[PDB]
Amino acid sequence: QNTVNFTYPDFWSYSLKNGTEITFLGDATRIPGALQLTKTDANGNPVRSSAGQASYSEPVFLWDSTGKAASFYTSFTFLLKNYGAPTADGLAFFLAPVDSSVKDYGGFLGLFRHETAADPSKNQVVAVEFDTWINKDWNDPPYPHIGIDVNSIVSVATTRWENDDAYGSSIATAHITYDARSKILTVLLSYEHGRDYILSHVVDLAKVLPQKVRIGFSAGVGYDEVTYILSWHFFSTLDGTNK
Amino acid sequence: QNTVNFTYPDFWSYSLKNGTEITFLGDATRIPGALQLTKTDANGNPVRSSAGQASYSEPVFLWDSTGKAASFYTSFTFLLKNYGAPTADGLAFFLAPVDSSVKDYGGFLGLFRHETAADPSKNQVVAVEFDTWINKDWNDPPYPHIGIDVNSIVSVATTRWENDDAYGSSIATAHITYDARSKILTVLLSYEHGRDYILSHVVDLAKVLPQKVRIGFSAGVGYDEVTYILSWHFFSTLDGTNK
Ligand SMILES: *[C@@H]1O[C@H](CO)[C@@H](O[C@@H]2O[C@H](CO)[C@@H](O[C@@H]3O[C@H](CO)[C@@H](O)[C@H](O)[C@@H]3O)[C@H](O)[C@H]2NC(C)=O)[C@H](O[C@@H]2O[C@@H](C)[C@@H](O)[C@@H](O)[C@@H]2O)[C@H]1NC(C)=O
Ligand SMILES: *[C@@H]1O[C@H](CO)[C@@H](O[C@@H]2O[C@H](CO)[C@@H](O[C@@H]3O[C@H](CO)[C@@H](O)[C@H](O)[C@@H]3O)[C@H](O)[C@H]2NC(C)=O)[C@H](O[C@@H]2O[C@@H](C)[C@@H](O)[C@@H](O)[C@@H]2O)[C@H]1NC(C)=O
Numbered sequence: 001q002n003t004v005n006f007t008y009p010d011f012w013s014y015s016l017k018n019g020t021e022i023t024f025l026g027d028a029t030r031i032p033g034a035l036q037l038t039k040t041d042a043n044g045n046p047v048r049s050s051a052g053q054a055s056y057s058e059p060v061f062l063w064d065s066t067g068k069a070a071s072f073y074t075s076f077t078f079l080l081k082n083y084g085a086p087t088a089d090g091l092a093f094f095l096a097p098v099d100s101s102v103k104d105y106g107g108f109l110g111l112f113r114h115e116t117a118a119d120p121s122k123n124q125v126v127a128v129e130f131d132t133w134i135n136k137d138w139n140d141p142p143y144p145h146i147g148i149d150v151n152s153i154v155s156v157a158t159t160r161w162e163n164d165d166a167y168g169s170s171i172a173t174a175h176i177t178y179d180a181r182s183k184i185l186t187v188l189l190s191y192e193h194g195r196d197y198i199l200s201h202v203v204d205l206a207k208v209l210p211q212k213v214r215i216g217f218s219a220g221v222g223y224d225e226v227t228y229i230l231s232w233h234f235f236s237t238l239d240g241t242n243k
Numbered sequence: 244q245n246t247v248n249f250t251y252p253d254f255w256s257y258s259l260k261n262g263t264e265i266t267f268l269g270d271a272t273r274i275p276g277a278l279q280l281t282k283t284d285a286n287g288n289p290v291r292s293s294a295g296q297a298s299y300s301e302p303v304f305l306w307d308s309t310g311k312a313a314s315f316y317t318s319f320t321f322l323l324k325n326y327g328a329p330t331a332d333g334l335a336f337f338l339a340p341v342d343s344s345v346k347d348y349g350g351f352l353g354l355f356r357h358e359t360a361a362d363p364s365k366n367q368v369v370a371v372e373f374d375t376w377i378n379k380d381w382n383d384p385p386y387p388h389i390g391i392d393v394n395s396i397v398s399v400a401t402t403r404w405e406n407d408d409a410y411g412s413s414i415a416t417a418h419i420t421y422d423a424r425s426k427i428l429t430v431l432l433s434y435e436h437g438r439d440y441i442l443s444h445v446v447d448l449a450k451v452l453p454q455k456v457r458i459g460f461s462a463g464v465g466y467d468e469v470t471y472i473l474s475w476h477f478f479s480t481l482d483g484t485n486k
């Protein structure tokens with residue numbers, strides 16, 4: 001089976017064993033109704049300096065030497081819970097090699113190591129980040145933003161994420177699509193009674209990632225913040241690539 | 244007010260006068276719960292050779308000489324009702340000049356005139372078409388498809404639309420986004436318990452359309468088919484363009 005198709009309308013079925021459908025790494029944990037990305041104390045309050053990842057267990061086929069490549073679409077709703085404003089550091093949906101694991105916390109969103117974070121030759125990861133903290137030292141724009149990261153914590157493209165949304169603690173729905181023919185990654189973020197955010201960028205996944213990858217969520221803190229993934233849908237197709 | 248933001252969860256409030264919020268042209272008509280794109284007889288059966296358009300009444304700002312450009316996102320659910328398979332001709336979401344009107348029926352989707360349909364210099368329209376009929380004479384690929392049209396009925400890009408969906412008569416939800424910074428148009432089509440379709444293409448709207456446009460739906464038939472738009476949401480932002 002070359003493609004994948006799954007939908008989790010909610011996560012109220014929290015009894016599944018770690019690693020069967022979803023794998024949790026670091027401080028990410030499964031709680032009733034959600035995948036909690038970082039650690040919280042007894043009362044459910046955000047702990048500082050924490051990193052965690054929740055990823056699909058089965059490897060995901062992206063491409064192969066025969067020209068076949070997967071176009072995909074993933075949607076998920078999440079609640080980035082904030083305690084005051086601003087908070088740090090955010091979350092990210094990512095695609096990394098099958099054997100990768102959680103990295104540094106804080107501004108690296110558990111996706112990179114401090115030492116190699118700004119070096120594209122030492123990283124193999126593509127991620128759509130929802131950044132809540134301005135790291136002047138890593139080139140973040142002067143406001144919360146949504147960014148597309150290709151092998152580095154320094155986004156190849158970003159777009160303003162308003163303070164009222166970034167620190168509003170309302171449920172948001174994200175749609176991320178990748179067209180394997182035009183090599184276009186598009187991110188759409190919506191708030192029920194608010195605005196929409198759009199960020200598209202040309203990025204050829206075949207040139208930067210291995211043939212099979214693991215997909216998931218990664219978060220890193222930071223302070224006064226915790227992310228919960230409430231639902232998740234993923235679909236891939238080989239359409240338009242000879243097969 | 245430079246940007247626009249509206250949401251129609253449904254169209255059960257059908258008493259609004261033609262031209263106030265939505266303008267209907269040709270055979271497009273407002274019926275309880277939907278915008279009907281083409282003509283049907285007494286029983287609600289599809290009539291042949293019909294064209295109609297349902298468009299937002301207020302002009303929509305796209306760009307201006309000062310560098311400011313609008314990124315946008317539109318979503319809508321529609322029921323393309325089919326009587327047998329195949330059917331013809333499809334529907335399209337489009338952006339055309341403010342003073343344009345409905346054109347030829349059939350494969351032109353009410354967006355072009357037979358005489359100038361394949362000449363980019365004689366048309367000013369960008370449309371995302373959901374094509375149900377293979378017009379060998381206008382370069383349609385050999386199957387139903389979703390295409391991006393820039394000033395011509397001959398799509399600059401397309402993607403397979405499976406027969407079971409194209410002629411299934413199930414409600415579909417479409418999301419179309421345009422990033423004014425990267426000049427990327429992305430189309431996402433989803434079926435509740437089925438698959439998703441993705442088609443992105445680089446197209447600079449500023450180079451092909453006027454500063455203000457009219458947005459809407461256009462359909463052309465054809466036979467054994469009628470399209471109903473069940474909901475519609477549109478949002479535009481000037482984010483990232485100096486203002
Ligand atoms: C869910 O299941 C995964 C494995 O499929 C758990 O992650 C794995 O945890 C192992 C340790 O518990 C890691 O290996 C150890 O490496 C050290 C050396 O660095 C050795 O001393 C030790 O003998 C093990 O070999 C293993 O690398 C790790 N897998 C990955 C891909 O990172 C996971 O555990 C959770 O995440 C890991 C990263 C740690 O943070 C754990 O503390 C944490 O529990 C399992 N998740 C849960 C919630 O149980
Ligand atoms: C909703 O309101 C619009 C106008 O804002 C209607 O469309 C307009 O209809 C006029 C005729 O009814 C068109 O003008 C006529 O042009 C001919 C010459 O070609 C003249 O003989 C005549 O005197 C008028 O000037 C006008 O061009 C048209 N507007 C546009 C932008 O096309 C609309 O009518 C519906 O659509 C038009 C295109 C026709 O198909 C009508 O039959 C049809 O009713 C109104 N819609 C409804 C449902 O009432």
Ligand SMILES: CO[C@@H]1O[C@H](CO)[C@@H](O[C@@H]2O[C@H](CO)[C@H](O)[C@H](O)[C@H]2O[C@@H]2O[C@@H](C)[C@@H](O)[C@@H](O)[C@@H]2O)[C@H](O[C@@H]2O[C@@H](C)[C@@H](O)[C@@H](O)[C@@H]2O)[C@H]1NC(C)=O
Nearest residue numbers: 048049050088089105106107108114133135137221222223
């Ligand atoms: C003062 O010493 C430590 O300085 C660090 C840099 O200012 C600081 O880390 C940053 O903290 C902010 C929140 O205030 C963001 O999380 C930001 O992403 C952090 O920077 C990242 O992580 C640090 C460790 C470093 O690798 C940077 O290159 C990277 O951009 C430390 O704060 C602590 O650690 C961070 C990760 C976070 O958990 C904080 O809440 C925590 O206080 C500073 N250490 C202190 C103040 O004790």
Ligand SMILES: CO[C@@H]1O[C@H](CO)[C@@H](O[C@@H]2O[C@H](CO)[C@H](O)[C@H](O)[C@H]2O[C@@H]2O[C@@H](C)[C@@H](O)[C@@H](O)[C@@H]2O)[C@H](O[C@@H]2O[C@@H](C)[C@@H](O)[C@@H](O)[C@@H]2O)[C@H]1NC(C)=O
Nearest residue numbers: 291292293331332348349350351357376378380464465466
């Ligand atoms: C045989 O004479 C007429 O030939 C036309 C071309 O085959 C045909 O139009 C096509 O009809 C199919 C459906 O069978 C599609 O709608 C297709 O898009 C039509 O072609 C378009 O429209 C025609 C008029 C022309 O401009 C083409 O360049 C263009 O691609 C005619 O069919 C009639 O008209 C069309 C529009 C549609 O309403 C049909 O249902 C209708 O029968 C042919 N006329 C006939 C058979 O009487």
Ligand SMILES: [Ca+2]
Nearest residue numbers: 107131133135
């Ligand atoms: Ca940051």
Ligand SMILES: [Ca+2]
Nearest residue numbers: 350374376378
């Ligand atoms: Ca056609």
Ligand SMILES: [Mn+2]
Nearest residue numbers: 131140147155
């Ligand atoms: Mn950032």
Ligand SMILES: [Mn+2]
Nearest residue numbers: 374383390398
């Ligand atoms: Mn076509």
